[PDB]
Amino acid sequence: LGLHFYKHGEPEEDIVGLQAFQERLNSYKCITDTLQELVNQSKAAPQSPSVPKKPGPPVLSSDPNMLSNEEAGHHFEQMLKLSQRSKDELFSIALYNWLIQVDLADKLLQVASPFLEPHLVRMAKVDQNRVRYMDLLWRYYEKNRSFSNAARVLSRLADMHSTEISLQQRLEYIARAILSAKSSTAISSIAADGEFLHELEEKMEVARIQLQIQETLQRQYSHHSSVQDAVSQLDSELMDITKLYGEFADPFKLAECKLAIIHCAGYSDPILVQTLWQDIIEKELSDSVTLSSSDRMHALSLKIVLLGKIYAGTPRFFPLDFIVQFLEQQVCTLNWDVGFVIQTMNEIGVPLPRLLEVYDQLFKSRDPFWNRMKKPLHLLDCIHVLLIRYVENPSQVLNCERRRFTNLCLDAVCGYLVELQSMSSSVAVQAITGNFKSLQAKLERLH
C-alpha cells in the first residue's frame, strides 16, 4: 500500500496508503540513521592529542567501543553494500533521498538499480530543488552512456530552470551538452542532435559574453550597490544579446563587452564587422603594452586564433583580407616577425590557397603604406615565408588541388621575380631575388 500510494501520486485521499508509506519509512529509519552515524563518524576530524596534564605514558582517552574513521568508513561501505541487496523499491527511494541529503552524490551514481531513473524522473517534476534532480539525471545518463538523453536533460537546465553555484556552472552544462551531442552524432547521425549542437555552441558564446560582463562588474564596479543586483541577475538566467547590451553593457559603459556583444547578433556586415576586428586588434595591442614583442605576438595570436575558429566558418563575420592587411600593417609598424600573420591564419585553419590570394592582391595593390614605412618589399617576404611553409609541408594543400597550386605558385613566383628585377638592385632586392629563385628551385620539384 505504501508503494501503491507513491506510484499513483502520493494523494491526500489515501490516508491508508499514506499510513503504510509512513510506517515503511519509520522502519527504514533505523537503517538511515545508523548509516548517518557511521558517515558522521567517518566525516569527523581526527582529534589532536590533548597535552598530558600529568607526566607518564600516553593514556588512550577513548572508549574501547569507539570506531576509527577507517572502521566507520569500512562498516558504512559494508552496510551500504548490505542495503544495496534489498528488493524494496520504497526503501531504495528512501536510500536515494538520504544519499542526496548527505551529499553522497557519486555513491547514488554507484547504485545500478532500475528504480533510480524513475525516481529522478519523479523528483525533477515535484521538488522545488528540481535542478539537483536534472543534474543527477544527466550525470546518470552520461555514466550509463545515454548521451542523447543526457544532452536532452542538459538542455533542460538551460531551457527550463536552474539555481547552481555561479554562471560558471552553466558553462560546464553547455560544454558537457556539446560533448554529449557530439557523442550522440558520432554514434548516430540524426540531424536533430547536430542541429541542437549549433544552438548549444551559439548559447556557449552568449554565455561567455554574459560571464565577461558579470566578472567585469566585479573587477571594475564592485564598490557600487547595484553591481550586486546586476551580478545576481547575470547568475539567474541565460540572457539574450538585447539585455546584455541595453540593461548591462551600456549602463556600466563596458566598451570591452559592447564590442563582443555586437560581434555576433544579426548585424550589417562589411564596414561594421571590419571596425570590430580593428577594435579587437587595437585593444589587445593596447593592453599588452607592458609585455615583450614575443609575448604580445602570442597574446594577439591567441585572440585572433580563438575568434577566427568561430567566425571563419561564416565569412561575413570574418573579413580575412582586411584582417591580414591590418595585422601586417601592425607587424610592419611594431617590428614583429614576418612569419606572424602567416602563423595566425594557419593556426585558425585558413585554407592556404585562399591565404595566398590575399597576399597576392595586397601586393598588387602597391599600397603606399609599405613605401611610407620604408619596407616596400614586406609583402614579398610574407609571400616567401608562406610559400616556403607550403613547400616544406605540402600537406597544407589538398591531394587533388596541389598540382593546380604548384602551377599558380610558379606563375606567381615568376611574376614577383619580374617585379623584383625591375627594382633598384639594393642588397635586399638581391637577397629576395635569391630567396624567390631558391623557392622556385624547390617548387620545380613539387609537381
Binding site: 551559439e202 552568449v206 557600487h224 550597490s225 547595484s226 543586483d229 546586476a230 539574450d240 544579446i241 538585447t242 547590451y245 541595453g246 540593461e247 548591462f248 551600456d250 549602463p251 556600466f252 556583444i261 555586437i262 555576433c264 547578433a265 544579426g266 548585424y267
Partner: peptide, 19 residues
C-alpha cells in the same frame, strides 16, 4: 537570443539604488 536591439530611450540606471 542572437538578435541585438538598441533601446537607449528606457534603461534602468545602473549607478543608482532601486526605488
Amino acid at each position: 537570443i542572437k538578435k541585438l536591439v538598441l533601446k537607449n530611450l528606457n534603461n534602468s540606471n545602473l549607478f543608482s539604488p532601486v526605488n
